[PDB]
Write a protein that binds this DNA or RNA. Structure first.
Ligand code: DTP
Lengths: 403, 540
DNA sequence: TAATTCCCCCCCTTCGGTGCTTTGCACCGAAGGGGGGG
């Protein structure tokens, strides 16, 4: 076992357990009974002062319940990613690969014991329906799924397992994040599935992405044959906001067209100087912003905005007005009236993209009330990881500027 | 009890308490002497000598059944120096979550904490001195061999020990329902009464094998069962009687007690309102200060007394039926709700009156009430109910499609309860053709707290007013108010204020600011309003 | 002052911290009071 340690000056997770539905509680009770039967977890008392929330999910097109532990506080602690070699330096070819498949390999973590002095930090409490009994406390004896230290500790065995596969197939890029293997190949989709089956059989004896289609979302000015005072005002506001992202944006002529109190419906013809300025600003907006580089030291911030009609926009950035990525997640409605489900799916997709591109989950600024999210997000969550998030309580300044 | 002790330690680098015992009344001293003699006879406490340097004050209070004393220790210093625990009690069981049972028994464990041994290495920290009658002799010094009352670790340790003791019996009897709250046991079964009593005797013998006695004084065998503050009948449940104080003059503490009792009553009595009474507690300082009723708290108190006059009951959960929560508005940001499975057979009742945010509307408050009801229903029954809301499907559709936040309500249907929920005005998506256009401007300085607020109109009209003790945000809101006041039924308004526009676009109908309330009244009065934001002084 | 305890859930009010910026204003969590349980 690896002597895991907490970060200096840190205590340990003390997060309360949120209430769970009856089906989730029954699934958790059955799963934890089975796990305790084989020694993966052990019952503990209240003298352990630590706790992390637990719940259950159902995977995509899967009828089996999977236990999920919210180890976010423990992951914010636990500097173990240096003492044991962290996940290998993020491959830059995964983002450029054609087909990427995500495989769940967290079960292997249950085969390696956890350091005893750290086990007390993995404590969790199963609640009871109607508080019939006090919550049942367990702690992990093996490497837990969802903990940042589990892949770091298991990396040696993971590389040993994957070496017969990586040498045979040197054109395939395999990345590991949390309990997931992101395996990417440029082969045909049928050959990709066949190779995935071979890798699965390799793991047994020992969900496909397409990053090539991930397109940025540029800010585009509207095109009109007749511009009203309201239209020019909206365009000037949009350009004034974009001037913080694209230095060199000029609005002098357009703002000169907005002097003197006039009706918003009044049609004002565009001068030649204003027309040229608009064309130059449009072509400036066409080219992507240059001067933005991913800093591995700093954290990723993902902002999400609701645009209506089942559309959401998102920006992943490390510094304000300096976007590493901009995108749009569209559910095209289609019998989808659930805003919370759409936001949860968008968060999962953005997190998967961030893991593929930079190897890090971003910190989300969710456009939702906190209580709604904490009430409903676990009902639609399918991923085995949980990103950090905060909730915006003010209407976005961007509004429609990201469209 | 032969149950294994839970290992407990002090916080690192900390020592045991050395707090001197305060003087005690002779009655308290006699009661403590009798209790300590009985406990030392039973081995629950042990005499100690000079080798123990610790001390903690002790006292006694009266139990619910008088003529019996509860011995407490003021372990505040030791609690400060004791390791942290994780509480296993996650909530309170509710009778509405109980299923109907043919046979029911309520059992209480006697001298609960004193039947659970304490970790030996910790015992020296529980030292205390029982003072001498009047005075003279030095007092007798003891230490606890069991869980003391007043120590922050005792409840969690007792709950875990009780769970461990109960688990084999529950394993052997899966058809017996056991609600354990600390030491209180509710035991329900679908057996015949004789078989149920045999099972109860088996459970009592099993508990006695673990040193937990179940005295007959708290052994309930016939309905109604007094359980956890409720009266349980075979087919219904009520709260134990609630006595509202009837005072001619009210103090702050009296109003607080009344509001708390009404909040407790609201779980089964429908229509309880406490807003006007809670408003009396705003700005008060002394708990003994006499607060006169404001003739709005008088009406609320009269209505609550009328509600409490008639006896109400809840029903038990039927897992084979559907949970339905129906919500009604009461005004002033107050909502009531009833959770039932059959019509007019309430499983539970409740209210929601939280005022979140400076500016809100009825739709946001209804969503908050739905969230609260959903969380409570998940806690009690493990599932979310179907909702009956006084909001049109079209209104909710418009709100959640035009709102910038992710909002959702679970499966719900519209119920035509006359106080319906609606949005009182709509902001136009496009400028209104032919409507007058106001360009509003509000500025203020941070030194003199003086500013101006005015507008210029495309038809040549203009106005400007000065404001004192007003911030820039207040001046911008005032400018929008001026535009609303001086305009016709339809108006386009152009503001440089992101703050005021962000407030107005949320469509509030109530606010904590009177200026925003006046703006809301003007907006409701209007027919078509378009709000446009212009960046800055670049151009009008 | 006078009575001094512990743990859990809830509501309502107050106050300080946090964040964005328009250094005021909005939001949130913890702690005070109260209710209820043991
Ligand atoms: N006021 C209190 N202060 C501290 N702990 C308390 C208090 N009331 C109850 N408890 C704790 C300690 C008790 O042992 C346990 C169970 O309460 P309760 O049934 O009232 O008393 P008990 O089990 O000591 O007495 P009894 O034998 O009379 O039933 O809960």
């Amino acid at each position: 076992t690896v002597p895991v340690k907490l970060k200096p000056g840190m205590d340990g997770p003390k997060v309360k357990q949120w209430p769970l539905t009856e089906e989730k509680i029954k699934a958790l009770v059955e799963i934890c009974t089975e796990m305790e039967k084989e020694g993966k977890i052990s019952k503990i008392g209240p003298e352990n002062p630590y706790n992390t929330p637990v719940f259950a999910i159902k995977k995509k097109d899967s009828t089996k319940w999977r236990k999920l532990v919210d180890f976010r506080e423990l992951n914010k602690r636990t500097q173990d990613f240096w003492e044991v070699q962290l996940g290998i330096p993020h491959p830059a070819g995964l983002k450029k690969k054609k087909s990427v498949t995500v495989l769940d390999v967290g079960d292997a973590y249950f085969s390696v014991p956890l350091d005893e002095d750290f086990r007390k930090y993995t404590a969790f409490t199963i609640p009871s329906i109607n508080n019939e009994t006090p919550g049942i406390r367990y702690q992990y004896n093996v490497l837990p799924q969802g903990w940042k230290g589990s892949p770091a500790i298991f990396q040696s065995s993971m590389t040993k397992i994957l070496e017969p596969f990586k040498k045979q197939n040197p054109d395939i890029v395999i990345y590991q994040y949390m309990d997931d293997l992101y395996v990417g190949s440029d082969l045909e989709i049928g050959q990709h599935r066949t190779k995935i089956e071979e890798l699965r059989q390799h793991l047994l004896r020992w969900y496909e992405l397409h990053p090539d289609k991930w397109t940025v979302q540029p800010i585009v000015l509207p095109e009109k044959d007749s511009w009203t005072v309201n239209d020019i005002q909206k365009l000037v506001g949009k350009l004034n906001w974009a001037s913080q992202i694209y230095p060199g944006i000029k609005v002098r002529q357009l703002c000169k067209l907005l002097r003197g109190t006039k009706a918003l419906t009044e049609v004002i013809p565009l001068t030649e100087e204003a027309e040229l300025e608009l064309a130059e600003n449009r072509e400036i907006l066409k080219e992507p912003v240059h001067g933005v580089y991913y800093d591995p030291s700093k954290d990723l911030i993902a902002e999400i905005q609701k645009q209506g009609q089942g559309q959401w926009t998102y920006q992943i950035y490390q510094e304000p007005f300096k976007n590493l990525k901009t995108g749009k997640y569209a559910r095209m409605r289609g019998a989808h009236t659930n805003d919370v489900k759409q936001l949860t799916e968008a968060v999962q997709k953005i997190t998967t993209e961030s893991i593929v591109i930079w190897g890090k989950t971003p910190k989300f600024k969710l456009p939702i009330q906190k209580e709604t999210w904490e009430t409903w997000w676990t009902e639609y969550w399918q991923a085995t990881w949980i990103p950090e998030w905060e909730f915006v309580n003010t209407p976005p300044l961007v509004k429609l500027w990201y469209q | 009890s032969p149950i294994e002790t839970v290992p407990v330690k002090l916080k690192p680098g900390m020592d045991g308490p050395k707090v001197k015992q305060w003087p005690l009344t002779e009655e308290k001293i006699k009661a403590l002497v009798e209790i300590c003699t009985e406990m030392e006879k039973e081995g629950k406490i042990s005499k100690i000598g000079p080798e123990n340097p610790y001390n903690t004050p002790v006292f006694a209070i009266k139990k619910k059944d008088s003529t019996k004393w509860r011995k407490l220790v003021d372990f505040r210093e030791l609690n400060k120096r004791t390791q942290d625990f994780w509480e296993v009690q996650l909530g309170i069981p509710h009778p509405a979550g109980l299923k109907k049972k043919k046979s029911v028994t309520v059992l209480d464990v006697g001298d609960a904490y004193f039947s659970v041994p304490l970790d030996e290495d910790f015992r020296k920290y529980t030292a205390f001195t029982i003072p001498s009658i009047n005075n003279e002799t030095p007092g007798i010094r003891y230490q606890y061999n069991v869980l003391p009352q007043g120590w922050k670790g005792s409840p969690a340790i007792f709950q875990s020990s009780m769970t461990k003791i109960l688990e084999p019996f529950k394993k052997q009897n899966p058809d017996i329902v056991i609600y354990q709250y600390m030491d209180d046991l509710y035991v329900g079964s679908d057996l015949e009464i004789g078989q149920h009593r045999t099972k109860i005797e088996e459970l009592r013998q099993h508990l006695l094998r673990w040193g937990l006695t179940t005295p007959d004084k708290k052994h309930q065998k016939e309905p109604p069962f007094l359980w956890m503050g409720y009266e349980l009948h075979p087919d219904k449940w009520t709260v134990q009687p609630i006595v509202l104080p009837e005072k001619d003059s009210w103090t702050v503490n009296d109003i607080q007690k009344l509001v708390g009792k009404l909040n407790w009553a609201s779980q089964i009595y429908p229509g309880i309102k406490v807003r006007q009474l809670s408003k009396l507690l705003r700005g008060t300082k002394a708990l003994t200060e006499v607060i006169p009723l404001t003739e709005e708290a008088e009406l609320e108190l009269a209505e609550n007394r009328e509600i409490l006059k008639e006896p109400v009951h809840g029903v038990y959960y039927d897992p084979s039926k559907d949970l339905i929560a129906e919500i009604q508005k009461q005004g002033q940001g107050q909502w009531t709700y009833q959770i039932y499975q059959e019509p007019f057979k309430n499983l539970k009742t409740g209210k929601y009156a939280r005022m979140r945010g400076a500016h809100t509307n009825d739709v946001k408050q209804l969503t908050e009430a739905v969230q609260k009801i959903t969380t409570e229903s998940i806690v009690i029954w493990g599932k979310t109910p179907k909702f009956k809301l006084p909001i049109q499907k079209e209104t909710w559709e418009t709100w959640w499609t035009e709102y910038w936040q992710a909002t959702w309500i679970p499966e719900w249907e519209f119920v035509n309860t006359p106080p319906l929920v609606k949005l009182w005005y709509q902001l136009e998506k496009e400028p209104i053709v032919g409507a007058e256009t106001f360009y509003v401007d509000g500025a203020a300085n941070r030194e003199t707290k003086l500013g101006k607020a005015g507008y210029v109109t495309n038809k040549g009209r203009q106005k400007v007013v000065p404001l004192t003790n007003t911030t820039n945000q207040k001046t911008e809101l005032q400018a929008i108010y001026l535009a609303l006041q001086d305009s016709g039924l339809e108006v386009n308004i152009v503001t440089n204020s992101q703050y005021a526009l962000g407030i107005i676009q949320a469509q509030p109908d109530k606010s904590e600011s009177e200026l925003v309330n006046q703006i809301i009244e003007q907006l409701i009065k209007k027919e078509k309003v378009y709000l446009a934001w212009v960046p800055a002084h670049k151009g009008i």
